[PDB]
Write a protein that binds this ligand. Structure first.
Ligand SMILES: [Br-]
Ligand SMILES: [Br-]
Ligand SMILES: [Br-]
Length: 228
């Protein structure tokens, strides 16, 4: 049978993203809009820094900027925590450790407001080097493909997720960003607690040639795998 959570994603869903950030005291806000098509694991989003210039590189925020849009193969439907928490939603928390630099801590509430899927995020960054790769804007405007590893956390009625992002630095090297994540439902109802599996991501970053505000256009495809 098709669950209520699943049913909410069978078509194209509008997305709204709102982020308030503070990294080493540099405060900033970002809005984003677009749409998600979970049947195809497809996200199309555009983000605007509404406070002026973004004080960190856009690529460092890609992971923070709606895993309910992942394409789960039919045979893995019973492992889709994210959709099972809908419409009431889930809270996602991460710590992102930039190797040899600072860390971001994030908290996102992901839920429906009417027909719109909303990702409302608070991000706090501390201990960054003011001339490191982040605050010194040394990262390339591009993005690699990665796997994200998911396991159940029964004791929390949620999941634990971990993965490593490698950001290309302008000198040809790599800035590693080690991600630790937990998700917990907002409601009190049952969710799907998955067996171990992963999501496979590919991401493309671009610019809107008519946009004069500081911004990022993101095209992302996400597919669940690892159980067959
Ligand atoms: Br950038
Ligand atoms: Br998050
Ligand atoms: Br790219």
């Amino acid at each position: 049978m098709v669950s209520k959570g699943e049913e909410l994603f069978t078509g194209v869903v509008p997305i709204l993203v709102e982020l308030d950030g503070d990294v080493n005291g540099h405060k900033f806000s970002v809005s984003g809009e677009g749409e998600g098509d979970a049947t195809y694991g497809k996200l199309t989003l555009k983000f605007i820094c509404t406070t002026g210039k973004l004080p960190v590189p856009w690529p460092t925020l890609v992971t923070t900027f709606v895993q309910c849009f992942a394409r789960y193969p039919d045979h893995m439907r019973q492992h889709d925590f994210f959709k099972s928490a809908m419409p009431e939603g889930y809270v996602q928390e991460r710590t992102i450790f930039f190797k040899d630099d600072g860390n971001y801590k994030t908290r996102a509430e992901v839920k429906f407001e009417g027909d719109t899927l909303v990702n409302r995020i608070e991000l706090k960054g501390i201990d960054f080097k003011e001339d490191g790769n982040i605050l010194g804007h040394k990262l390339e405007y591009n993005y690699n493909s990665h796997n994200v590893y998911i396991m159940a956390d029964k004791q929390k009625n949620g999941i634990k997720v971990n993965f490593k992002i490698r950001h290309n630095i302008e000198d040809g090297s790599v800035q590693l960003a080690d991600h630790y994540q937990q998700n917990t439902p907002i409601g009190d109802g049952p969710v799907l607690l998955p067996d171990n599996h992963y999501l496979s991501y590919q991401s493309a970053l671009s610019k809107d040639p008519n946009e004069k505000r500081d911004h990022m256009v993101l095209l992302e495809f996400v597919t669940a795998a690892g159980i067959t």
